Design a protein around this ligand. Structure first.
Ligand code: NA
Ligand code: NA
Ligand code: NA
Length: 153
């Protein structure tokens, strides 16, 4: 089994809208996140990446899922820990890396999101917790995947 590298993903989910970020350099909407750094907890890495990529500062995040990504031709798995909060207290800010944008929950921009999001994002919206795994050939094609609802992440 391949080694895996720790990443975070953060979804700001309010009752009628969700915050996504357009990857500027790319072209898909995503939650905010990045690699976990040495010595920080996964949740603290998620808070840090939310601040760096979206400008939002939050004190706490709720873990809602974990997704492992395998890319054909790449040696490592991406082990993505997915977090969610409903509670913010500042405005998102656009950088040269991510442009944050709100979407109503009947307008989730799946056509411009990664293909795996079609499977797990509905579980997140239902307040279900999940474990997923997706194998990709390139950016567009899923060759294999698993997804399970769990009671504990
Ligand atoms: Na990132
Ligand atoms: Na899509
Ligand atoms: Na994704």
């Amino acid at each position: 089994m391949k080694a895996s590298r720790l990443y975070t993903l953060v979804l700001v989910l309010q009752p009628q809208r969700v915050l996504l970020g357009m990857k500027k350099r790319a072209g898909r909407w995503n939650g905010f996140g990045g690699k976990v750094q040495e010595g920080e907890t996964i949740e603290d890495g998620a808070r840090r990446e939310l601040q760096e990529e979206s400008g939002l500062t939050v004190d706490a995040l709720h873990k809602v899922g974990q997704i492992v990504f395998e890319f054909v031709g790449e040696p490592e798995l991406m082990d993505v820990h997915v977090f969610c909060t409903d509670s913010i207290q500042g405005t998102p800010v656009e950088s040269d890396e991510m442009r944050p944008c709100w979407f109503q929950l009947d307008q989730i921009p799946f056509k411009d999101m990664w293909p795996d999001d079609s499977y797990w994002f509905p579980l997140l919206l239902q307040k279900k917790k999940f474990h997923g795994y997706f194998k990709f050939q390139g950016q567009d094609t899923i060759l294999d995947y698993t997804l399970r609802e769990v009671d504990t992440v």
